[PDB]
């Protein structure tokens, strides 16, 4: 997917304009809240849903992670 995206963003109609690259404010906002924060939120979600139950002997996987809440109170 990333290789395809790299090819795609070299097409004339998809190549981002120069002003887009130098949009410092939006880049910082997204790469802080999105790339760092949401990513960390997703990782802690993984730890709560998968890592911790797996460490406590409970098998959580894609086939059963939607019906077994990580905490009994939920």
């Amino acid at each position: 997917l990333l290789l395809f995206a790299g090819w795609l963003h070299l097409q004339p109609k998809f190549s981002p304009s120069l002003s887009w690259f130098k949009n410092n404010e939006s880049r910082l906002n997204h790469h802080l809240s999105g790339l760092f924060g949401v990513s960390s939120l997703a990782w802690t979600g993984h730890l709560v849903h998968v890592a911790i139950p797996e460490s406590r002997g409970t098998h959580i996987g894609w086939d059963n992670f939607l019906t077994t809440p990580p905490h009994p109170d939920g």
Partner: peptide, 30 residues
């Protein structure tokens, strides 16, 4: 314990990715 089918489909997806890499590089356009 990965079966031969799993290895084969991994190889197929790797071949697709390799072709995409070929095209991306070609498009970087030296």
């Amino acid at each position: 314990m990965v079966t031969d089918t799993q290895v084969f489909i991994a190889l197929v997806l790797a071949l697709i990715s390799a072709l995409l890499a070929i095209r991306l590089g070609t498009k970087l356009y030296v």
